[PDB]
Structure 1
Amino acid sequence: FDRDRLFSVVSRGVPEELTGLLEYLRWNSKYLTDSAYTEGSTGKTCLMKAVLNLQDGVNACIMPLLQIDKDSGNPKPLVNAQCTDEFYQGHSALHIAIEKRSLQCVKLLVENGADVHLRACGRFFQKHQGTCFYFGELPLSLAACTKQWDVVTYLLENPHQPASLEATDSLGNTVLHALVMIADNSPENSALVIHMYDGLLQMGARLCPTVQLEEISNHQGLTPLKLAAKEGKIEIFRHILQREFSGAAAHH
């Protein structure tokens, strides 16, 4: 049951065609995370391939793949495999499910042991000069930047592995810093970014009541307010001030 066959089956989404895979793995002491079953250059797995081929948010090969991986006795769970090349380093199936805008797939991955804090940190995902795909590296931060409120709340609230609002990326950026980084003057985008920022804070009020999320400094010692100023994001800067003063006045 070779890699070519496997990648074909999972791309077409026909789980009946996985019959015999488990037995093959078990007879030959192989796992789906082995180099024989990944694309050499990137470490792309059959699970990543499956999530890349969602249709209406689903791929009926996903749960069977997870189940075969578990039954194969794999000590390095397929669900948490990450890309290995310089460009995609750290990208996981969970990241792809979020990129594909599939809450259903997110839930399936999370219920089956997906690590919600894996960092997509390769060059494609870094802050650099010009147009970036920087979203703060973290599944929560990705879901927030791509404006996926239902994914955000699920990541925060799920009983399996809740994502931490305090988690930071390779820059020391929280989701709040990531949002500042993608703020711009698109009136559409700006409103959505600000409402996401507020919704996260409201969630944090309940989920981590004693933590001042807006006081967390990144690797350059910048809070989201100071970052907004530095990056020239005037609208969110003003919003952050307005929040601070309205919050103090409400408490006073």
Structure 2
Amino acid sequence: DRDRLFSVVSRGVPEELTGLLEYLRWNSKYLTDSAYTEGSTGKTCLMKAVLNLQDGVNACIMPLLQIDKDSGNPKPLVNAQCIDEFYQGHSALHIAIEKRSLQCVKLLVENGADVHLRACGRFFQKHQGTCFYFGELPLSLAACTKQWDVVTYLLENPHQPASLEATDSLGNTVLHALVMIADNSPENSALVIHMYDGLLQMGARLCPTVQLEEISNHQGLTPLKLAAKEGKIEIFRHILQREFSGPYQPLSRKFTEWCYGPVRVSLYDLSSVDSWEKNSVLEIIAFHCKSPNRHRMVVLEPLNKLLQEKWDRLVSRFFFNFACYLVYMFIFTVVAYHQPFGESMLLLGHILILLGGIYLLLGQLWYFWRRRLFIWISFMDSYFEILFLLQALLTVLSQVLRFMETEWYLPLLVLSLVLGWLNLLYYTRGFQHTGIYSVMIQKVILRDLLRFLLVYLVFLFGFAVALVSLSRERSILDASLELFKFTIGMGELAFQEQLRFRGVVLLLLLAYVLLTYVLLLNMLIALMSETVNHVADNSWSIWKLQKAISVLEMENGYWWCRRKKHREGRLLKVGTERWCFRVEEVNWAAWEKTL
């Protein structure tokens, strides 16, 4: 379109254009405003003026320097590009900040640039093309791009000072954006850590009366909790145990002292405390974490020892529950065996089992009520909670079915007994030597064996149908037990005499036996191939995570008795006023480093 000739002109000599633009304008000056509608499909002339990128100063004598002279509509607050153009939602300030042109930012802010201008349209490109979620704010964009001078000028700006506590549409602040853009790479982690520390220090200097890290977004999360939930570990670890020595000492979470010779004692601040002041870091890691890195964040330093202490404080309850469950199982087994003064004992046993079953069912329902559909986070580690529910439901249903005197009582009671007996294996959470292998072998079995029984059953059914179809001239389709006898050791492989096609039957049996031996050999070799010698420390972490889940569940208390929350390691005292956790360790290299 030739009509867009006014959009781009020879910069440096805007004599006739400016003379014809300001005032006069033949009929009326409103045409000038229309020039901003016809400049492009959503992009103004200022955007191209910034995008020229000439040597040194980009636009020499920028037209804006005189445009504000003939301004009736606020032009420095450019309408951000709309629709979908792969650059929509960007203002002049955003473009100037991107090209690392401090001079352009200065000229724009001098003419009254609108700070805190959220990128209206950028969230379209967030899902359409290049996402690069940076925070939708000029300050966030400057901080995430590692431009210290631009951030410094924007914050302590005499004309329009940017607010460090400003928030975007999602509720994120600059720290939240820095946490979100972080990924587990050696360079980005260092960049985000440096930017986080610098911004925190500058915020303390400029505004020492505001807690930047205590601001929460719409989801109800802080930068620490957000880092824990999103799976970022490097920034999470740095935030968890950062310490400052100079005047910025209060902005620290770990305080270290030498006490008595070469024994170092360190105090960690506790905002990642347990269920107390709920919706904390431990609960977020344990439950609300889709990332597969959740098992690696429970062995950092404060969390590991805190969970160890909590487990050491609650092993007695775990063993008491185990003993009670064992007693209930023994009583149920005795009642099931003795079931045909004795009649009264049998009735007492039956009613006691009914109460136990309804109690277990109600407990499982309460647990599933506490944890909502969010349980879709994972199921590889919480499959016993549905087995317990199934066993309790079967027991209750059988017990209530007994009162109608139906003849199906015995099968359901026996199924409940066997399921309850099988569910006892869950209590191997303790006994570390067993658990380290048990958790990983459970993961391997659940991942692998589920794709064996299907194909083996399909082949068994096919072979059984073939045999029964051939032998009709093994009498029914249900007579497929012969193949199971073959795979367990029996089978009676012999000539069938009266069947004329005995050779075909023998060939089919040979094919089936070689096929099933080959399949089981394949499974064996695959299960061995899983052992890549990577579970040396990747399996201990899983056991620690299981222990953390167990202690979180136990310390919540029973449904019929809400246990009072423990005050944990209070140690209020005076930190240079905040609750702290104290840990001592004997270190010689660190002690010998100093003199």
TM-score by length of 1: 0.81
Contact 1:125 1:133 (C-alpha < 8 Å) held by counterparts: no
Would the alpha carbon gap of residues 175 and 20 (structure 1) be closer, same or farther in structure 2, given more than 3 Å must change? Answer: same
Moved more, 36-45 or 166-175: 36-45
Match of 1:189 in 2: 188
Q: Structure 1 CA distance, aligned partners of 2:32 and 2:198?
A: 37
Deviation at 1:13, TM superposition (A): 6.4
Deviation at 1:101, TM superposition (A): 1.3
Would the alpha carbon gap of residues 37 and 121 (structure 1) be closer, same or farther in structure 2, given more than 3 Å must change? Answer: closer
Summarize deviations over 1:13-44 as a string: whole Å, max 9, x none: 65457443433675554469845424687521
Deviation at 1:168, TM superposition (A): 0.5
Moved more, 81-90 or 14-23: 81-90
Summarize deviations over 1:156-207 as a string: whole Å, max 9, x none: 1121111111000111110000000111122112111111111111111122
Would the alpha carbon gap of residues 155 and 123 (structure 1) be closer, same or farther in structure 2, given more than 3 Å must change? Answer: closer
Deviation at 1:208, TM superposition (A): 1.6
Would the alpha carbon gap of residues 180 and 87 (structure 1) be closer, same or farther in structure 2, given more than 3 Å must change? Answer: same
Q: Structure 1 CA distance, aligned partners of 2:60 and 2:175?
A: 35
Contact 1:167 1:174 (C-alpha < 8 Å) held by counterparts: yes
Deviation at 1:74, TM superposition (A): 3.4
Contact 1:143 1:151 (C-alpha < 8 Å) held by counterparts: yes
Deviation at 1:79, TM superposition (A): 5.2
Deviation at 1:4, TM superposition (A): 4.3
Q: Structure 2 CA distance, aligned partners of 1:129 and 1:22?
A: 38
Deviation at 1:78, TM superposition (A): 5.4
Q: Structure 2 CA distance, aligned partners of 1:36 and 1:13?
A: 20
Summarize deviations over 1:137-173 as a string: whole Å, max 9, x none: 0000000111111111111112111111100011111
Count matched residues. 246
Q: Structure 1 CA distance, aligned partners of 2:10 and 2:189?
A: 37
Contact 2:86 2:125 (C-alpha < 8 Å) held by counterparts: no
Secondary structure (helix, strand or coil) at the match of 2:170 reads coil
Summarize deviations over 1:197-241 as a string: whole Å, max 9, x none: 111111111222111111111110111111111111101111112
Deviation at 1:124, TM superposition (A): 4.9
Contact 2:36 2:45 (C-alpha < 8 Å) held by counterparts: yes
Moved more, 12-21 or 38-47: 12-21
Match of 1:111 in 2: 110
Q: Structure 1 CA distance, aligned partners of 2:117 and 2:24?
A: 27
Would the alpha carbon gap of residues 168 and 106 (structure 1) be closer, same or farther in structure 2, given more than 3 Å must change? Answer: same
Moved more, 13-22 or 169-178: 13-22
Q: Structure 1 CA distance, aligned partners of 2:158 and 2:41?
A: 32
Would the alpha carbon gap of residues 78 and 102 (structure 1) be closer, same or farther in structure 2, given more than 3 Å must change? Answer: same
Would the alpha carbon gap of residues 114 and 123 (structure 1) be closer, same or farther in structure 2, given more than 3 Å must change? Answer: closer
Contact 1:125 1:135 (C-alpha < 8 Å) held by counterparts: no
Would the alpha carbon gap of residues 39 and 165 (structure 1) be closer, same or farther in structure 2, given more than 3 Å must change? Answer: farther
Deviation at 1:117, TM superposition (A): 0.8
Deviation at 1:80, TM superposition (A): 6.6
Would the alpha carbon gap of residues 131 and 246 (structure 1) be closer, same or farther in structure 2, given more than 3 Å must change? Answer: farther
Identity over aligned pairs, percent = 100
Would the alpha carbon gap of residues 30 and 46 (structure 1) be closer, same or farther in structure 2, given more than 3 Å must change? Answer: farther
Match of 2:44 in 1: 45
Contact 1:10 1:49 (C-alpha < 8 Å) held by counterparts: no
Secondary structure (helix, strand or coil) at the match of 1:188 reads helix
Match of 1:26 in 2: 25
Deviation at 1:108, TM superposition (A): 0.8
Deviation at 1:92, TM superposition (A): 0.9
Q: Structure 2 CA distance, aligned partners of 1:33 and 1:230?
A: 52
Q: Structure 2 CA distance, aligned partners of 1:39 and 1:72?
A: 17
Q: Structure 1 CA distance, aligned partners of 2:84 and 2:29?
A: 23
Would the alpha carbon gap of residues 125 and 163 (structure 1) be closer, same or farther in structure 2, given more than 3 Å must change? Answer: farther
Would the alpha carbon gap of residues 171 and 78 (structure 1) be closer, same or farther in structure 2, given more than 3 Å must change? Answer: closer
Contact 2:47 2:95 (C-alpha < 8 Å) held by counterparts: yes
Moved more, 79-88 or 137-146: 79-88
Contact 1:10 1:61 (C-alpha < 8 Å) held by counterparts: no
Summarize deviations over 1:66-97 as a string: whole Å, max 9, x none: 42233243355555766566975542100010
User: What are structure 2's unaligned runs of at least 5 residues?
Assistant: 247-595
Q: Structure 1 CA distance, aligned partners of 2:192 and 2:159?
A: 27
Would the alpha carbon gap of residues 133 and 38 (structure 1) be closer, same or farther in structure 2, given more than 3 Å must change? Answer: farther
Moved more, 8-17 or 46-55: 8-17
Contact 2:90 2:122 (C-alpha < 8 Å) held by counterparts: no
Q: Structure 1 CA distance, aligned partners of 2:31 and 2:194?
A: 41
Moved more, 52-61 or 183-192: 52-61
Q: Give the number of the structure whose alpha-carbon radius of gyration is greater.
A: 2
Would the alpha carbon gap of residues 127 and 74 (structure 1) be closer, same or farther in structure 2, given more than 3 Å must change? Answer: closer
Would the alpha carbon gap of residues 73 and 128 (structure 1) be closer, same or farther in structure 2, given more than 3 Å must change? Answer: closer
Q: Structure 1 CA distance, aligned partners of 2:194 and 2:229?
A: 21
Would the alpha carbon gap of residues 108 and 75 (structure 1) be closer, same or farther in structure 2, given more than 3 Å must change? Answer: closer
Q: Structure 2 CA distance, aligned partners of 1:241 and 1:130?
A: 35
Match of 2:580 in 1: none
Matched, 1:35 2:37: no
Structure 1 residues 235-246: aligned runs within 5 Å: 235-243=234-242
Contact 1:11 1:53 (C-alpha < 8 Å) held by counterparts: no
Would the alpha carbon gap of residues 121 and 72 (structure 1) be closer, same or farther in structure 2, given more than 3 Å must change? Answer: closer
Secondary structure (helix, strand or coil) at the match of 1:32 reads helix
Contact 1:13 1:59 (C-alpha < 8 Å) held by counterparts: no
RMSD: 3.4
TM-score by length of 2: 0.37
Match of 1:231 in 2: 230
Question: Structure 1 segments of 4 or more deviating over 3 A?
Answer: 2-19, 23-36, 38-42, 72-90, 123-131, 243-247
Summarize deviations over 1:100-138 as a string: whole Å, max 9, x none: 111111111011100111011424577559962110000
Would the alpha carbon gap of residues 126 and 214 (structure 1) be closer, same or farther in structure 2, given more than 3 Å must change? Answer: farther
